[PDB]
Write a protein that binds this ligand. Structure first.
Ligand code: HEM
Ligand SMILES: CC1(C)O[C@]2(C)CC[C@H]1CC2
Ligand SMILES: [Cl-]
Length: 396
């Protein structure tokens, strides 16, 4: 019996703690023998689980194309995910347009405003003694950030969340496509406004940009809007919700972060290794051999980062959250030419969120009368994390 045969990142067995980690640990064990295996799911595809096998695949851009970055393909109609869905040379030119606003110096500019935002969100319920850390905090922090990056109203998070649900999780394709079509309609109006009244945001930036002398098509612009919205509302919210869930029951990890705030950035990196939401696919475009296995053009390889992140040949004690772990070269943010554009920004965001939360609410736990829930998929993590805590005071 192999766990690869029915491996499916949208349908991962959950264990008693509520997470797929027991399943990930079992798959990791098997990957020591078979680091790449065939899955029967989605009509058949390769599941790449070993650390060095994922490295080999992801560096080999000649045989493995980012046209398969989402598998099954995300619902973005006729639009492509910019950067993430392209290969070089096209990929490099698009990414170059937004490197500056994602650079560490550019994104550090938001730290103090992320800190205020986190404290304001906390104020909303600190007096209540209860709340869903996902919906109340983890979702809202990146949504509000992302709205400001894109020059959108920050109070319309429920609209952006609905768009992201359509792209990734609605299963009736009619609803899926239709709601993505609503994103497109909003995106066009914003582009038209920024065209005439340009601002500081990243959208105005790409709208005014040029490649080889020429403006970006409206479709290219919509692709930029789309992938940026996905990074914030989806990946970051799921990551933070898993972190909040962990901090809720893991009283040992929590007291250490409270006592050693200087360890929080390194801890954020270890939490990324352990709770990294993401997997990505690659479309095989050339016959290629990786380890014992020969892949053919047209096949897809799914890079199961959470398994590689637990590889005993790449990490000592991989099943433990070791907050002082260095160098910690996990694959949660990718590697090589497609390496996460928002890497530094999420590190700031997580450091701020954790810092402020533990500062305001040092004592809290999972609500024993409400359920947690894990969202499965290409972006995976806690979706509901009901917590209780002693009633406290607003800063406002
Ligand atoms: C915890 C949060 C996040 C995680 C785990 C994550 C994960 C990843 C991964 C694994 C990749 C590599 C894709 C590949 O190899 O095909 C990637 C790329 C990318 N990410 Fe992130 N991401 C996060 C947040 C964000 C945010 C906040 C943004 C921007 C607002 C963002 C924007 C991008 C873009 C544009 C790419 C494509 C880069 C390229 O193709 O060169 N991500 N991300
Ligand atoms: C799943 C993953 C990693 O997140 C986004 C935002 C970046 C790359 C891919 C697809 C979209
Ligand atoms: Cl290690």
């Amino acid at each position: 019996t192999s766990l690869f045969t029915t491996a499916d990142h949208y349908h991962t067995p959950l264990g008693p703690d509520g997470t797929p980690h027991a399943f990930f640990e079992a798959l990791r064990d098997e990957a020591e023998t078979t680091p790449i295996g065939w899955s029967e799911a989605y009509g058949g595809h390769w599941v790449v689980a070993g650390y060095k096998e994922i490295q080999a695949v992801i560096q080999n851009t000649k045989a493995f194309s980012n046209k398969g970055v989402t598998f099954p393909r995300f619902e973005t109609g006729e639009f492509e995910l910019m950067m993430a869905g392209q290969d070089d040379p096209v990929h490099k030119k698009y990414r170059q347009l937004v490197a500056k606003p994602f650079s560490p110096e550019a994104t550090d500019l938001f730290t103090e405003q992320l800190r205020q935002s986190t404290n304001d969100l906390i104020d909303a319920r600190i007096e209540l003694g209860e709340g869903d850390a996902a919906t109340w905090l983890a979702n809202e922090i990146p949504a509000r950030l992302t709205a400001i990056l894109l020059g959108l109203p920050p109070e319309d998070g429920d609209t952006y969340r609905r768009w992201v649900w359509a792209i990734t999780h609605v299963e009736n394709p009619e609803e899926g496509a239709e709601i993505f079509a609503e994103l497109v309609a909003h995106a066009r109006t914003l582009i038209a406004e920024r065209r005439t009244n340009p601002g500081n945001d990243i959208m105005s930036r790409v709208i005014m940009s040029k490649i080889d002398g020429e403006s970006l098509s409206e479709d290219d612009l919509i692709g930029f809007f789309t992938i940026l919205l996905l990074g914030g509302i989806d990946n970051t919210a799921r990551f933070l919700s898993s972190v909040f869930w962990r901090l809720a029951w893991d009283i040992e990890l929590r007291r250490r972060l409270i006592a050693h705030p200087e360890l929080i950035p390194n801890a954020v990196d270890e939490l990324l290794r352990f709770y990294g939401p993401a997997m990505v696919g690659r479309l095989v475009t050339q016959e290629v051999t990786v380890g014992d296995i020969t892949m053919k053009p047209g096949q897809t390889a799914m890079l199961w980062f959470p398994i590689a992140s637990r590889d005993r040949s790449a990490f000592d004690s991989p099943d433990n959250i070791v907050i002082e772990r260095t160098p910690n070269r996990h694959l949660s943010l990718g590697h090589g030419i497609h390496r996460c554009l928002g890497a530094h920004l999420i590190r700031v965001e997580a450091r701020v969120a954790i810092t402020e939360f533990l500062k305001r609410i040092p004592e809290f736990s999972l609500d024993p009368n409400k359920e947690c829930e894990w969202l499965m998929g290409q972006v995976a993590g806690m979706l509901h994390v009901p917590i209780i805590f002693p009633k406290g005071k607003r800063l406002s």
